[PDB]
Amino acid sequence: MYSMLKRVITEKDLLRQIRLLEQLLNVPQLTAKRLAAQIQTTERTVFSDLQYIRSQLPADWSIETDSSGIRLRNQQTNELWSLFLPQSISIQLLKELLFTKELVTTSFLSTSGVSYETLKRHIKKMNQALRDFHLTIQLTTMTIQLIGAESNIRIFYHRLLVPFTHNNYFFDDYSIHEEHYFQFLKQVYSSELTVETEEIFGACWFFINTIRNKANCRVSQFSFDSKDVLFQLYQPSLAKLYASEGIYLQGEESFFAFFCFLESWNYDNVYGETLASALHTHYSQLRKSLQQFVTNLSTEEARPDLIQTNLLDNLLLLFIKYTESPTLSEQFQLEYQELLALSKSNQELLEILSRYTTIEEPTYFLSLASLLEKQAIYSIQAQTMTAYFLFQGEPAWKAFLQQELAAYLGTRVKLQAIEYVELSQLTLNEADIIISNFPLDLPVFYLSLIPTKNELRRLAELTLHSYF
Amino acid sequence: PQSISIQLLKELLFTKELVTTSFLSTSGYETLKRHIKKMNQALRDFHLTIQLTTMTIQLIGAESNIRIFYHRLLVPFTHNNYFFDDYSIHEEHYFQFLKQVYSSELTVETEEIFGACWFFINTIRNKANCRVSQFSFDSKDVLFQLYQPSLAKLYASEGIYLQGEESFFAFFCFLESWNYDNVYGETLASALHTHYSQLRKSLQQFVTNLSTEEDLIQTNLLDNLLLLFIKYTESPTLSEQFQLEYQELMTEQLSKSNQELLEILSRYTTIEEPTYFLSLASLLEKQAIYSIQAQTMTAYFLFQGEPAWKAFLQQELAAYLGTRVKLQAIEYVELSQLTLNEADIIISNFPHLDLPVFYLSLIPTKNELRRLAELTLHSYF
Numbered sequence A: 001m002y003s004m005l006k007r008v009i010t011e012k013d014l015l016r017q018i019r020l021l022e023q024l025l026n027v028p029q030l031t032a033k034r035l036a037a038q039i040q041t042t043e044r045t046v047f048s049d050l051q052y053i054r055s056q057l058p059a060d061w062s063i064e065t066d067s068s069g070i071r072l073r074n075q076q077t078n079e080l081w082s083l084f085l086p087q088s089i090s091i092q093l094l095k096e097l098l099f100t101k102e103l104v105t106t107s108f109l110s111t112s113g114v115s116y117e118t119l120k121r122h123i124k125k126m127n128q129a130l131r132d133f134h135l136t137i138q139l140t141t142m143t144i145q146l147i148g149a150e151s152n153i154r155i156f157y158h159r160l161l162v163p164f165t166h167n168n169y170f171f172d173d174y175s176i177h178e179e180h181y182f183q184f185l186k187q188v189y190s191s192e193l194t195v196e197t198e199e200i201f202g203a204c205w206f207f208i209n210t211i212r213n214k215a216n217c218r219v220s221q222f223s224f225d226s227k228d229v230l231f232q233l234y235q236p237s238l239a240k241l242y243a244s245e246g247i248y249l250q251g252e253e254s255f256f257a258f259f260c261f262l263e264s265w266n267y268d269n270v271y272g273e274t275l276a277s278a279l280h281t282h283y284s285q286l287r288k289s290l291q292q293f294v295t296n297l298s299t300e301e302a303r304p305d306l307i308q309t310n311l312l313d314n315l316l317l318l319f320i321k322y323t324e325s326p327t328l329s330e331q332f333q334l335e336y337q338e339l340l341a342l343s344k345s346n347q348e349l350l351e352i353l354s355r356y357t358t359i360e361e362p363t364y365f366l367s368l369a370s371l372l373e374k375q376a377i378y379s380i381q382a383q384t385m386t387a388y389f390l391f392q393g394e395p396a397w398k399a400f401l402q403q404e405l406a407a408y409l410g411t412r413v414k415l416q417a418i419e420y421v422e423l424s425q426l427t428l429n430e431a432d433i434i435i436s437n438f439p440l441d442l443p444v445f446y447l448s449l450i451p452t453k454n455e456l457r458r459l460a461e462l463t464l465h466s467y468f
Numbered sequence B: 001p002q003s004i005s006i007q008l009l010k011e012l013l014f015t016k017e018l019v020t021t022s023f024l025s026t027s028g029y030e031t032l033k034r035h036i037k038k039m040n041q042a043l044r045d046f047h048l049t050i051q052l053t054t055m056t057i058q059l060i061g062a063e064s065n066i067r068i069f070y071h072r073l074l075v076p077f078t079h080n081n082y083f084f085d086d087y088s089i090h091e092e093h094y095f096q097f098l099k100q101v102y103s104s105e106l107t108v109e110t111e112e113i114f115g116a117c118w119f120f121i122n123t124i125r126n127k128a129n130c131r132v133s134q135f136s137f138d139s140k141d142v143l144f145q146l147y148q149p150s151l152a153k154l155y156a157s158e159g160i161y162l163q164g165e166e167s168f169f170a171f172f173c174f175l176e177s178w179n180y181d182n183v184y185g186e187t188l189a190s191a192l193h194t195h196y197s198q199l200r201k202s203l204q205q206f207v208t209n210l211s212t213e214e215d216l217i218q219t220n221l222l223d224n225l226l227l228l229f230i231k232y233t234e235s236p237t238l239s240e241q242f243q244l245e246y247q248e249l250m251t252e253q254l255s256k257s258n259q260e261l262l263e264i265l266s267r268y269t270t271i272e273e274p275t276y277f278l279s280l281a282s283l284l285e286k287q288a289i290y291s292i293q294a295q296t297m298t299a300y301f302l303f304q305g306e307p308a309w310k311a312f313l314q315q316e317l318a319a320y321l322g323t324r325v326k327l328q329a330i331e332y333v334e335l336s337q338l339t340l341n342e343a344d345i346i347i348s349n350f351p352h353l354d355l356p357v358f359y360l361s362l363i364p365t366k367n368e369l370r371r372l373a374e375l376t377l378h379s380y381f
Helices: A003-008 A012-026 A033-039 A043-054 A078-087 A089-099 A105-112 A116-133 A150-164 A174-189 A199-214 A229-243 A251-263 A273-281 A284-301 A304-308 A311-324 A326-335 A341-352 A363-378 A395-409 A453-461 B004-014 B020-027 B030-044 B063-079 B087-102 B112-127 B142-156 B165-176 B186-213 B221-234 B236-251 B258-266 B275-290 B307-321 B366-380
Strands: A061-066 A069-074 A102-104 A136-139 A143-147 A385-390 A413-417 A433-436 A444-446 B017-019 B049-052 B056-060 B297-302 B325-329 B345-348 B357-359
Touching: A003 A012, A003 A089, A003 A116, A003 A150, A012 A033, A012 A043, A012 A069, A012 A078, A033 A043, A033 A069, A043 A061, A078 A089, A089 A102, A089 A105, A089 A116, A089 A143, A089 A150, A089 A199, A102 A105, A105 A116, A105 A143, A116 A136, A116 A150, A150 A199, A150 A326, A174 A199, A174 A229, A199 A229, A199 A251, A229 A251, A229 A273, A229 A311, A251 A311, A251 A326, A273 A284, A284 A304, A284 A311, A284 A341, A304 A311, A311 A326, A311 A363, A311 B307, A341 A363, A363 B307, A385 A395, A395 A413, A395 A453, A395 B221, A395 B275, A395 B366, A444 A453, A453 B366, B004 B020, B004 B030, B004 B056, B004 B063, B017 B020, B020 B030, B020 B056, B030 B049, B063 B087, B063 B112, B063 B236, B087 B112, B087 B142, B112 B142, B112 B165, B142 B165, B142 B186, B142 B221, B165 B221, B165 B236, B186 B221, B186 B258, B221 B236, B221 B258, B221 B275, B236 B275, B258 B275, B297 B307, B307 B325, B307 B366, B357 B366
Parallel strands: A385 A413, A385 A433, A433 A444, B297 B325, B297 B345, B345 B357
Antiparallel strands: A061 A069, A102 A143, A136 A143, B017 B056, B049 B056
């Protein structure tokens, strides 16, 4: 979330205060002094932290404190983060290691204000969270450096800084650089290679790749195919984007930049005609195997509608992303928290992915496979619950109430009006319920004649196994 | 059981006049005058009142309003033996009556327990010699004729012969239990078409003229209004008195148009103080309009994170939020260029302070799914 940030701040008081700050931007209610539960500390410290914060807010911010509680008000949000984050040594150190491969230790001790042994002690802590990304900061009396494969260095920064894509402390004058990414998207969206993408994710990649290129930290050590078709199609417009920062991309950098862009592509996409035809013409082997797979999944769950969903196009794109570079696609999984009947049939997906590529721990991939499958199946499944509806009282109001309830319960809950006589029903499944206003064996949800706010909370709650 | 109140209801439920000493001692005069004048403040809400003399205890006002009050009082108690001695036996009689209707070409959907409870009360009141009078009705009315034989047979099962006014009133209790958005059997439908086609023609002009006055014709408004007009024209007096039952509902939940409705109404029946009719009519319009508005709020959806997750989550949010809510995926770009209305929210997990944002966690908790439902409530109710 900001949780990468949280793992990398080594100063606890400052982390605490960062957690306080987010609290009062995130929740524009009044928060109670009692909030201290949410931050997990004493109210005492909350009050000391607030005063700490107050003493250094820019003029147009304020924190107002009373009986009604605590609240942050302003007469833009990242100006607060730009004030507080650089107060942390570990963030200062990561900011400098993003822009140069190596720092002079004495010169960083000088600007941070700390002793070598103290920095050693912070860097030990930081190295515990970098461990997962396959990185470590080495500290000598001469040099401070970020050791690890350049691809993994960039993925870590991307995870860490994507939320700060509009922050001037990390990306000096970001808006001018983002305008370059916007211009590249316009050209893409206005051509027949148009493709939908996550633009903040894209733009932050553009920023990171530019900065590492200017600091002479180049990527390598991954397989790709120089002659890959999608790569060749997009290479020109990616060359122009990076050209706008005075970057020329050598062979490896150029594929990396393209891979980063590809990772930003959405599912259920709308592809321009040149992209479409390239995907129909140059990936017809993968496609056909996935077609077979989707027909066999549909057959095995007993609903041929599946074949008319986007599952085929989504799975193709998933496989493309993985077979473009297994080294990279694997390493890119670190951007996120890697958190039965499909999983059996997914052994066929797993064997198809041997046929084009090799992969080691496919758990993340299978889980994306599953999300796409599950998604497809839910787009076509009918209703997964029957809200049985027994209502005695004024007929006009029953009919209106019935209609409001069905609409509000959404398109997966069937609301069926029944009579007492008919309720001798062995049509009940672990999921189903009866809604009633009449006292009445069974699981019954009682509604007031005019449903209360409480009744409707609990009612939505009990639909939840039918939705996520 | 020790509610002296109840206890007085019951004797007057099952007995017209009381000897007051009988109650005075059958229970435990001045004390009773106290309980009655407090009772009497609710009674007034039904145009009822209890009267005490030394001689008798007596519920003054129309037998009709008494029975309506009892009905609001007991539809919940319909499967209770304290009020309805062996309800099981009696309800069985109501079920056979429905079958002789439901099997047959007179079928109509109704609220069966509201119906059963009317049958029980009308039985009780007739056997205790409290007759209704004091309304207007046509004995040769075709819907009444149609249902009279099956109703006569329902009451015959309790040993009752329906004396004329009691006949129509039992028919009306039944008619009042009929649902809207109904489906009618062949003989009922044919009656409807043969005796109300002109009225249907006039409500159809009305629905059109109302649909341009602000696409309603896709709704079921027409037939539901026909049914309203059918209930009402059977007895405006009884129609208005039965509104006493749900006073609560209506007094909190298109007025000029409805003058045409009244003028139409006036060609078939009297329209003296047609307050309820006007509230019912408004509630049908409301539901008809409701089903045809489509989207009343927009939830803009800003997501960054794993694209597979984006697509699943967008789908499931959209379904959960329902059809009256537009889930629109936007990029950060368009946030500044949103022209955004009262109801609208921004759902997100990328982070400007003062905005109608609802922050979602990459797997939303039951808890934040509760809150989200809440934000939609003014678009659904």
